[PDB]
Design an enzyme around this catalytic site. Structure first.
Site, PDB file in Angstrom:
ATOM      1  N   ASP A   1       0.810  -1.215   0.000  1.00 47.00           N
ATOM      2  CA  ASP A   1       0.000   0.000   0.000  1.00 47.00           C
ATOM      3  C   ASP A   1       0.840   1.260   0.000  1.00 47.00           C
ATOM      4  OD1 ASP A   1      -1.602  -2.342   1.440  1.00 47.00           O
ATOM      5  OD2 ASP A   1      -3.006  -1.052   0.467  1.00 47.00           O
TER       6      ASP A   1
ATOM      7  N   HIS B   1       0.935   3.437  -2.348  1.00 40.83           N
ATOM      8  CA  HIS B   1       0.065   4.545  -2.736  1.00 40.83           C
ATOM      9  C   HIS B   1       0.719   5.850  -3.132  1.00 40.83           C
ATOM     10  CE1 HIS B   1      -3.654   2.491  -2.337  1.00 40.83           C
ATOM     11  NE2 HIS B   1      -3.405   2.131  -1.095  1.00 40.83           N
TER      12      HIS B   1
ATOM     13  N   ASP C   1      -0.971  -2.172  -4.402  1.00 39.00           N
ATOM     14  CA  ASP C   1      -1.525  -0.818  -4.224  1.00 39.00           C
ATOM     15  C   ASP C   1      -0.390   0.189  -4.272  1.00 39.00           C
ATOM     16  OD1 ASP C   1      -4.240  -1.347  -4.270  1.00 39.00           O
ATOM     17  OD2 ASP C   1      -4.626  -0.642  -2.247  1.00 39.00           O
TER      18      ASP C   1
ATOM     19  N   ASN D   1      -6.139  -3.639  -5.507  1.00 38.30           N
ATOM     20  CA  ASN D   1      -7.325  -3.083  -6.166  1.00 38.30           C
ATOM     21  C   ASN D   1      -7.070  -1.737  -6.810  1.00 38.30           C
ATOM     22  OD1 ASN D   1      -7.221  -2.325  -3.311  1.00 38.30           O
ATOM     23  ND2 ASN D   1      -9.117  -1.193  -3.656  1.00 38.30           N
ATOM     24  N   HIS D   2      -6.175  -0.920  -6.241  1.00 34.50           N
ATOM     25  CA  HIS D   2      -5.931   0.377  -6.870  1.00 34.50           C
ATOM     26  C   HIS D   2      -5.128   0.306  -8.161  1.00 34.50           C
ATOM     27  CE1 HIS D   2      -7.932   3.097  -4.044  1.00 34.50           C
ATOM     28  NE2 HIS D   2      -7.672   2.162  -3.148  1.00 34.50           N
TER      29      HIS D   2
ATOM     30  N   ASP E   1      -7.343   1.467 -10.848  1.00 32.37           N
ATOM     31  CA  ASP E   1      -7.884   2.828 -10.841  1.00 32.37           C
ATOM     32  C   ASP E   1      -7.670   3.474 -12.198  1.00 32.37           C
ATOM     33  OD1 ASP E   1      -8.425   2.521  -8.140  1.00 32.37           O
ATOM     34  OD2 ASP E   1      -6.843   3.878  -7.474  1.00 32.37           O
TER      35      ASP E   1
ATOM     36  N   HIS F   1      -3.395  -9.090  -1.533  1.00 31.84           N
ATOM     37  CA  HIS F   1      -3.932  -7.766  -1.321  1.00 31.84           C
ATOM     38  C   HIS F   1      -5.342  -8.035  -0.896  1.00 31.84           C
ATOM     39  CE1 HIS F   1      -3.602  -3.560  -1.541  1.00 31.84           C
ATOM     40  NE2 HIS F   1      -4.903  -3.582  -1.768  1.00 31.84           N
TER      41      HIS F   1
ATOM     42  N   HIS G   1      -3.793  -4.047   1.725  1.00 35.24           N
ATOM     43  CA  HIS G   1      -5.187  -3.606   1.589  1.00 35.24           C
ATOM     44  C   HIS G   1      -5.811  -2.977   2.817  1.00 35.24           C
ATOM     45  CE1 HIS G   1      -8.977  -3.071  -0.335  1.00 35.24           C
ATOM     46  NE2 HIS G   1      -9.605  -4.012   0.341  1.00 35.24           N
TER      47      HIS G   1
ATOM     48  N   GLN H   1      -4.294  -1.960   5.334  1.00 28.30           N
ATOM     49  CA  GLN H   1      -3.327  -0.939   5.716  1.00 28.30           C
ATOM     50  C   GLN H   1      -3.095  -0.857   7.204  1.00 28.30           C
ATOM     51  OE1 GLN H   1      -4.269   1.634   1.691  1.00 28.30           O
ATOM     52  NE2 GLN H   1      -3.550   2.774   3.476  1.00 28.30           N
TER      53      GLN H   1
ATOM     54  N   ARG I   1     -15.061  30.340   5.392  1.00 32.80           N
ATOM     55  CA  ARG I   1     -15.446  29.904   6.714  1.00 32.80           C
ATOM     56  C   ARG I   1     -16.773  30.438   7.212  1.00 32.80           C
ATOM     57  NH1 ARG I   1     -12.022  29.003  11.919  1.00 32.80           N
ATOM     58  NH2 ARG I   1     -10.593  28.300  10.222  1.00 32.80           N
TER      59      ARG I   1
ATOM     60  N   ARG J   1     -19.783  27.400   7.353  1.00 31.77           N
ATOM     61  CA  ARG J   1     -20.123  26.970   8.709  1.00 31.77           C
ATOM     62  C   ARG J   1     -21.487  27.516   9.143  1.00 31.77           C
ATOM     63  NH1 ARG J   1     -14.437  26.562  12.127  1.00 31.77           N
ATOM     64  NH2 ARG J   1     -13.245  25.940  10.259  1.00 31.77           N
TER      65      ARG J   1
ATOM     66  N   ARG K   1     -11.852  24.571   3.241  1.00 34.73           N
ATOM     67  CA  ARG K   1     -10.850  25.539   3.659  1.00 34.73           C
ATOM     68  C   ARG K   1     -10.512  26.706   2.768  1.00 34.73           C
ATOM     69  NH1 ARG K   1     -10.616  24.261   8.993  1.00 34.73           N
ATOM     70  NH2 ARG K   1      -8.588  25.320   8.963  1.00 34.73           N
TER      71      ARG K   1
HETATM   72  N1  LIG Z   1      -7.529  17.139   9.965  1.00 35.84           N
HETATM   73  C1  LIG Z   1      -8.752  17.586   9.705  1.00 35.84           C
HETATM   74  N2  LIG Z   1      -9.559  16.921   8.842  1.00 35.84           N
HETATM   75  C2  LIG Z   1     -10.786  17.391   8.592  1.00 35.84           C
HETATM   76  N3  LIG Z   1     -11.370  18.489   9.112  1.00 35.84           N
HETATM   77  C3  LIG Z   1     -10.519  19.139   9.981  1.00 35.84           C
HETATM   78  C4  LIG Z   1      -9.239  18.764  10.326  1.00 35.84           C
HETATM   79  N4  LIG Z   1      -8.673  19.646  11.229  1.00 35.84           N
HETATM   80  C5  LIG Z   1      -9.621  20.513  11.403  1.00 35.84           C
HETATM   81  N5  LIG Z   1     -10.773  20.271  10.689  1.00 35.84           N
HETATM   82  C6  LIG Z   1     -12.031  21.048  10.647  1.00 35.84           C
HETATM   83  O1  LIG Z   1     -11.778  22.365  11.138  1.00 35.84           O
HETATM   84  C7  LIG Z   1     -12.562  22.654  12.308  1.00 35.84           C
HETATM   85  C8  LIG Z   1     -11.665  23.438  13.215  1.00 35.84           C
HETATM   86  O2  LIG Z   1     -11.345  24.651  12.520  1.00 35.84           O
HETATM   87  P1  LIG Z   1     -10.047  25.474  12.748  1.00 35.84           P
HETATM   88  O3  LIG Z   1      -8.855  24.565  12.724  1.00 35.84           O
HETATM   89  O4  LIG Z   1     -10.099  26.613  11.839  1.00 35.84           O
HETATM   90  O5  LIG Z   1     -10.385  26.028  14.190  1.00 35.84           O
HETATM   91  P2  LIG Z   1      -9.730  26.947  15.256  1.00 35.84           P
HETATM   92  O6  LIG Z   1      -8.999  28.015  14.489  1.00 35.84           O
HETATM   93  O7  LIG Z   1      -8.998  26.200  16.311  1.00 35.84           O
HETATM   94  O8  LIG Z   1     -11.086  27.637  15.890  1.00 35.84           O
HETATM   95  P3  LIG Z   1     -12.460  26.969  16.448  1.00 35.84           P
HETATM   96  O9  LIG Z   1     -11.927  26.160  17.576  1.00 35.84           O
HETATM   97  O10 LIG Z   1     -13.348  28.136  16.826  1.00 35.84           O
HETATM   98  O11 LIG Z   1     -12.990  26.182  15.298  1.00 35.84           O
HETATM   99  C9  LIG Z   1     -13.013  21.336  12.831  1.00 35.84           C
HETATM  100  O12 LIG Z   1     -14.242  21.493  13.539  1.00 35.84           O
HETATM  101  C10 LIG Z   1     -13.120  20.485  11.583  1.00 35.84           C
HETATM  102  O13 LIG Z   1     -14.354  20.617  10.877  1.00 35.84           O
HETATM  103 ZN   LIG Z   2      -4.264   0.426  -0.252  1.00 34.82          ZN
HETATM  104 ZN   LIG Z   3      -6.235  -2.016  -1.499  1.00 32.69          ZN
END
Ligand SMILES: Nc1ncnc2c1ncn2[C@@H]1O[C@H](COP(=O)(O)OP(=O)(O)OP(=O)(O)O)[C@@H](O)[C@H]1O
Ligand SMILES: [Zn+2]
Ligand SMILES: [Zn+2]
Length: 516
Positions: free
Chosen positions: A16, A18, A59, A91-92, A95, A192, A227, A229, A341, A345, A376
Site C-alpha cells: 500500500d 500509494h 496498491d 485493487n488500486h 484505478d 492484497h 489492503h 493498511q 469559513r 459553517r 478551507r
Molecule cells: N484534519 C482535519 N480533517 C478534517 N477536518 C478538519 C481537520 N482539522 C480541522 N478540521 C475542521 O476544522 C474545524 C476546526 O477549525 P479550525 O482549525 O479553523 O479552528 P480553530 O482556528 O482552532 O477555531 P475553532 O476552535 O473556533 O474552530 C473542525 O471542527 C473540523 O471541521
Molecule cells: Zn491500499
Molecule cells: Zn487495497
C-alpha cells in the site's frame, strides 16, 4: 535441496505504497531512504550467507498528486532500484485503464502477480499466478492474490471482460498446481486482501486470516499482505495492537501454521521476516517492522536512514514535474465557489455541493455529508488548478462510504443536523432535503424521495467524519463501511477536470435543508 543444510532466508516486504515515492514534509519515508535500508539489509544477509526476497502487497497506485499525475511511473521505477522481486496486484492497480496497468508492467522489472483475476470470456488468468525464485539451490514460489471486492466497491470502471474470483479458493488451486508441477521448496503468498482480527471481515470480502484457516496447515510459509493498511503486530491472540509504535516489537499473526504479516502503508516500514529452512521445514526465527525515518511529533524513533543518491537523482525529475503540474489548469468555473469559513459553517454552499457531488460520483453514493469546517478555501470564477483544489481540501482526508438502512439514515441525518451553524461541525449535505424542527427532521428525503426504512442507501463522506470527527456518529465500526483510499483533493480535482467547464448554477442550494 541439500539434506540437513540450513538455509537462511530473509523476506522483506511493504504494501500500500500509494504513490509515496518521495519523502514527506517531515522527512519521513520515501523510496530513497527505503533503498538505503534494503541495500543495507542485503549486505548484512549476504555477509551471513543468506538470501533475500523483497515482496510487495500491492496498491502502488493512487494517493499522492505527483505520483498520480504520472501514473505512478516514479514509484515503479523506484521499486526497480530498491529491487523488488514481485508484487501482488492491488485493487488500486485498477484505478487506471488497463492500458496504464500494462504500461506499469512494462516499467516494472519484477512481476505483478495475481492468480485470481480472470478474463471472463475465456476463463484464462489475466496475469501470472506466481513467480519462481532460485535462492541458493532452493525453489521459492510466490503466488499473488487480489481481493475480490476490487470490482465491487465504489463506482467501478475498467473491468471490461474481467472478473475477480474468490482468492482463498484460488489459493487452494494454485498451491496444488505448484506442488504437482514445480514442487517448490517454499511457497509464500503476496496478497492484497486485508488482515481482520480473528477473520472478522464483516461486510468486506474474506481476507488473509480466513484464507490461512481454510488452507492446509502450514501450506504457505507466510502471507505478505496489504489492503487493510495495518502494521500486523499482535497484542493478544487474534487481536492486532491498536496504535502500534514504530521501533517496538512486532509479533506477526500466525494462523493455521501460516504467518501473516503487513507493513502498514506508504513505505512507512520495511517488514523483515528472517527464516531458517532445513529439510522442508520453514521456521521463522525473527520478525520486525523496520521504520523508514518515521518521526514522533518530529524526532526519529530509530536511527536515521540516509536517502540514497541514485534514487534521489532518479526520482527528482518526477517530483519536480509533478509539482509543476499542480499549477496547470484542470478546469474552469463560471462563478465563485464559496468555501469561506463564515459561509460554509452557516449555510449550504455551492462548494459544499460540488465537493459532495464529486464524492458521490466516485463512490456510487446516493447522498453525502461533510463538516463545513472541512472546506478551507473558495475558488474564484475562472481557471482552476490542482493547487487551487489542494487549498480547498488540504487535510488529506480519505473519501469513504457507508451502506445503511433507511432507519440508519434517519438516525444519522437527525444526529448530524443537530450540529449548529457557527461551528466547524455544521454539516454540508448533498441530495438531502428536510425541515428540521425541535430536533426532528420533517419531510426527510433523499434524491427527492421520502426515506424508506426498508431500503438501502449509500452515503459518502470523509474518514474524518466517519470516525467521529466533529462529533459525528461513527460509521467506521459499522458493517457496510468502506474506506476507498481516495484522497479528498484527488477526488475533487478529477471530478472538476472531467466536468469542466463547470456551470456552477448546477451546485447552487435551493433551500433543500432548513432549520427552524
Ligand atoms: N484534519 C482535519 N480533517 C478534517 N477536518 C478538519 C481537520 N482539522 C480541522 N478540521 C475542521 O476544522 C474545524 C476546526 O477549525 P479550525 O482549525 O479553523 O479552528 P480553530 O482556528 O482552532 O477555531 P475553532 O476552535 O473556533 O474552530 C473542525 O471542527 C473540523 O471541521
Ligand atoms: Zn491500499
Ligand atoms: Zn487495497
Amino acid at each position: 535441496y541439500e539434506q540437513d543444510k540450513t538455509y537462511k532466508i530473509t523476506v522483506l516486504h511493504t504494501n500500500d505504497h500509494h504513490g509515496h515515492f518521495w519523502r514527506n514534509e517531515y522527512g519521513e519515508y520515501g523510496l530513497a531512504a527505503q533503498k538505503t535500508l534494503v541495500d543495507g539489509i542485503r549486505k548484512e544477509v549476504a555477509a551471513e550467507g543468506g538470501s533475500v526476497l523483497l515482496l510487495s502487497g500491492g496498491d502502488i497506485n493512487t494517493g499522492v498528486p505527483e505520483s498520480d499525475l504520472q501514473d505512478a511511473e516514479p514509484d515503479f521505477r523506484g521499486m526497480n532500484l530498491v529491487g523488488y522481486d514481485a508484487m501482488a496486484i492491488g485493487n488500486h492497480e485498477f484505478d487506471n485503464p488497463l492500458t496504464v496497468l500494462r504500461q506499469q508492467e512494462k516499467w516494472a522489472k519484477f512481476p505483478l502477480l495475481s492468480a485470481n483475476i480472470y478474463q471472463k470470456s475465456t476463463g484464462e488468468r489475466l496475469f501470472k499466478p506466481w513467480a519462481l525464485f532460485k535462492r541458493q539451490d532452493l525453489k521459492i514460489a510466490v503466488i499473488g492474490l487480489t481481493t475480490d471486492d476490487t470490482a465491487k466497491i465504489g463506482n467501478p470502471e475498467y473491468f471490461t471482460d474481467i472478473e475477480f474470483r474468490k482468492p482463498a479458493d484460488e489459493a487452494k488451486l494454485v498451491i496444488q498446481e505448484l506442488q504437482q508441477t514445480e514442487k517448490p521448496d517454499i511457497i509464500i503468498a503476496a496478497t492484497h486482501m486485508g488482515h481482520y482480527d480473528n477473520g472478522e471481515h464483516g461486510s468486506n470480502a474474506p481476507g488473509d486470516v480466513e484464507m490461512a484457516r481454510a488452507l492446509p496447515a502450514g501450506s504457505l510459509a507466510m502471507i505478505v499482505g496489504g489492503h487493510s493498511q495495518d502494521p500486523v503486530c499482535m497484542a493478544a491472540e487474534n487481536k492486532k495492537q491498536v496504535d502500534y509504535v514504530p521501533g517496538t516489537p512486532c509479533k506477526p499473526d500466525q494462523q493455521n501454521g501460516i504467518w501473516i504479516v503487513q507493513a502498514h502503508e506508504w513505505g512507512k516500514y520495511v517488514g523483515r521476516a528472517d527464516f531458517e529452512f532445513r529439510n522442508g521445514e520453514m521456521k521463522m526465527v525473527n520478525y520486525q517492522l523496520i521504520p523508514v525515518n518515521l518521526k514522533k511529533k518530529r524526532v526519529l524513533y530509530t536511527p536515521e536512514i540516509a536517502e540514497n543518491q541514485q534514487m534521489i537523482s532518479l526520482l527528482s525529475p518526477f517530483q519536480n514535474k509533478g509539482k509543476a503540474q499542480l499549477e496547470v489548469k484542470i478546469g474552469e468555473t463560471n462563478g465563485r465557489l464559496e468555501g469561506d469559513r463564515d459561509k460554509v459553517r452557516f449555510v449550504q454552499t455551492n462548494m459544499g455541493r460540488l465537493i459532495l457531488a464529486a464524492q458521490m460520483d466516485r463512490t456510487g453514493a446516493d447522498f453525502a455529508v461533510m463538516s463545513g469546517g472541512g472546506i478551507r478555501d473558495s475558488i474564484e470564477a475562472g481557471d482552476i488548478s490542482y493547487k487551487n483544489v489542494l487549498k480547498v481540501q488540504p487535510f488529506g482526508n480519505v473519501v469513504v462510504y457507508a451502506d445503511m438502512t433507511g432507519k440508519e439514515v434517519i438516525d444519522y441525518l437527525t444526529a448530524v443536523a443537530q450540529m449548529k451553524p457557527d461551528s466547524g461541525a455544521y454539516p454540508q449535505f448533498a441530495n438531502v432535503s428536510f425541515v428540521a424542527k425541535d430536533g426532528k427532521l420533517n419531510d426527510l428525503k433523499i434524491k427527492g424521495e421520502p426515506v424508506d426504512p426498508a431500503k438501502t442507501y449509500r452515503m459518502a463522506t470523509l474518514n474524518f467524519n466517519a470516525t467521529g470527527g466533529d462529533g459525528y456518529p461513527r460509521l467506521d465500526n459499522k458493517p457496510g463501511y468502506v474506506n476507498t483510499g481516495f484522497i479528498d483533493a484527488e477526488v475533487l480535482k478529477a471530478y472538476i477536470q472531467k466536468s469542466s467547464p463547470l456551470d456552477v448554477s448546477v451546485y447552487e442550494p435551493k433551500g433543500e435543508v432548513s432549520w427552524q
